[PDB]
Amino acid sequence: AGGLSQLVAYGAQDVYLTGNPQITFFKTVYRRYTNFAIESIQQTINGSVGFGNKVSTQISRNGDLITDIVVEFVLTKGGNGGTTYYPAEELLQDVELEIGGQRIDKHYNDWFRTYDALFRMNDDRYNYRRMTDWVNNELVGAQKRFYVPLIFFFNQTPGLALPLIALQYHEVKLYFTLASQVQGVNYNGSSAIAGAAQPTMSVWVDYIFLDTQERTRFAQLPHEYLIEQLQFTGSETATPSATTQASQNIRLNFNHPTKYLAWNFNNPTNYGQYTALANIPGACSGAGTAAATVTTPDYGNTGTYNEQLAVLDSAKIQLNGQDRFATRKGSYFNKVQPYQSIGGVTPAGVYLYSFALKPAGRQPSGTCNFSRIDNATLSLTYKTCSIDATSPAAVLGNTETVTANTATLLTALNIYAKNYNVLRIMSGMGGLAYA
Amino acid sequence: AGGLSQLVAYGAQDVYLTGNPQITFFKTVYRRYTNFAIESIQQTINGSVGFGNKVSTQISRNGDLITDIVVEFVLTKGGNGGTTYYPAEELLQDVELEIGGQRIDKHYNDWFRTYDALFRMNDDRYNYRRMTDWVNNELVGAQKRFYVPLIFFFNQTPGLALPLIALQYHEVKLYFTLASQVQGVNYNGSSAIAGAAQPTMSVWVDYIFLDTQERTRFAQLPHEYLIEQLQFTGSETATPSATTQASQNIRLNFNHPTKYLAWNFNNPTNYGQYTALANIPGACSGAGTAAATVTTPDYGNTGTYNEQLAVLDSAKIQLNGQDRFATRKGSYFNKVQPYQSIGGVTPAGVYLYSFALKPAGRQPSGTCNFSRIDNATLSLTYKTCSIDATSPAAVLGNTETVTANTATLLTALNIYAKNYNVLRIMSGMGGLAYA
Amino acid sequence: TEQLRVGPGLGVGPEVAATGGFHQFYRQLPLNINEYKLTQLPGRLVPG
């Protein structure tokens, strides 16, 4: 009786699992690794910090390799809880990574929002929100420090730690653009908030200090890294109407082996708004009450999973005029793609199409090389904007091909592509192999 | 058209990903493993079981190796929903692990709370809460069996299973201390609950039964395991006040390669209270209404992510008087460190500083060896306790450097360190390589 | 005179005008004071 009675229940069907065994589970071997230490060091920001300003920093040579980078901001609330939406992210309009004077990469606040929407999840996403927003119903005048991690290839894993030590003759810089306005901090919709404070900013870089063996090798030997980059093109949405299903063919000026494409439609007025506004409990300012308006979101609840307020009916990607895959509905891109490939939950209005088995990982797993595609095009069909957004019944009881009349406010389209390039470093200098 | 239209788009940039391929993702070879079986066997507990008692159990020799250990408790609610907080965790005040007559490790109820608060996440964290508390609005008299998994190194991975088989002359024992009181079970704040049931306790050990050759090897060959240990000392907190920012230099009596430090401040009266009480929802008993009293927590909602109620303004760690890293704010340790190193969400009042790239894993990834550091010191700066906790506006709309007047109740400081040691087992005996 | 105008770079004699660019390779480690005041006691067993 007991576990031994299972062990003896052994025969031919077990050979495939345990015959001529190779491994066990009950004895582990850890690998010995090169000695290193990690330190979080503050960088000096040049330029004036404030809303709408451009500032920058040259990463100091204090350690050998760099990994994580966090931009801290101190913001204050210009209104009560519910008036902000990830404002630290909205503020950091963009970040540009420059090495040796070459643009290696560049992120935008909207990418940070899109990235989060697709790749962070569960409590990571919640903890992530806690570092960029006010999530405990804070009130006007509240002050908090926010931490916006950067998401450049070397900021996600030690595996790609940038070997500043191997770049003896090159600069490494971060250029940061701060938004002219941040919702619930210095502006409320279009209105400025009198007395709003200017942000305090600090950027931190986590350095790896190597022991002699590796410090020596990194400085002396050439390196090659397979890294990722973000490509981004902004365009106008073929805005849908109550009288028609707008359609659009967007030529995609992308290059390089692309892991995936991602896109969203948005109202540029309101950061993170990828859906229509409606008088349903979480879809607009004052929703559910007599004060409800479908011209302004309940900012703290800007994001939603209610696809009824999204505008993509269907889409396909064409490569050199040929369909890549059969046309699928917007919900395929919003719900199925990330189910199958990421395992997180993507909010309405954000779409993903992967060319990779694991778009969320570092390891390449299938790519579409746009450097060899003369004409790649994204083909979109929009929903019909005929639903009266001020009547929750109209929204909640609607059909697959329609959306809110207020969905016509989502006039901006952001198309992203994440691709793989090669960073090469030799004799103190480096940059990327392909343009 | 279709997938073939992508394969054709091949060029120089693809060679780096797919040229001279090593693997395919579409054919997996699974490793053949040894033949083993797992059985859950109940252990006998010596000593009276009840609140405040110390009991012990010797692990039987039913199998060859042991992994998981789960302690069962049966408790009845001494009050209504909202009166308890992780009561089974509170009850298991501590547990000692003795192998071969030598202490290997020791955990405390607060460690279980800290550990969970810091390293578990998402659904695993919720399932854990389900096994240690009442989370379905149970009422007074409700009876529930709780499970408190132990978190010793051999309870985390089968790879570190204790080879009872290779410990022929050495006993393995568990010593447990049961709390004198458990909130909402036998006491309500300081008051006893007459008639409260005494706990029923039982310890379960999951045994591994190995087949013929693997058992032989374990019994005869020497083994060394790289395992984790918890170091812990309780300290007096340099309690903050409305009139000042307290500060404190705490010399840390730690040794061994340390993956990380973790700490919290708490109100020793209220288990798991790491934050100040306030009249905001969940922050005190009756919070948000007329009866709100900021002297007692809403026990069922004792924990929170509302940083305003935390007391750490900033901190740093010094080695031999030298700063290890630049001083960072309390929210760095609470939100950022976990973001970077764990990926979960850590409750306010709970802090982490890692010396490791991935401290949450089994595999060492950089450590601080305190056996080679003469003076390791944790330097803390506290927030000013000037906020009138009974006035939500005072709390929710305030600045970064202040907290609740009730934050001065968090007078206990718990500092932990998680390190590595080596468990050497051979010739019928075993114990740790270093002291 | 000649007006040498020495550039940046430490860890070498005065005959080198510049050694590193933005990141010189020369790095120094702290002496790890009171290293002798640490015993590093090994662990032992009990009578089985």
Partner: peptide, 29 residues
């Protein structure tokens, strides 16, 4: 002591011209 090699990479598909970026050792005694 720095190692300078050839950086074995695949042949470019359409062009033959690219950016060389020769190594340099910035040090003057």
């Amino acid at each position: 002591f720095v190692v300078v090699g050839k950086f074995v990479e695949p042949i470019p598909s359409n062009p033959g011209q690219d950016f060389t970026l020769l190594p340099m050792d910035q040090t003057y005694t």
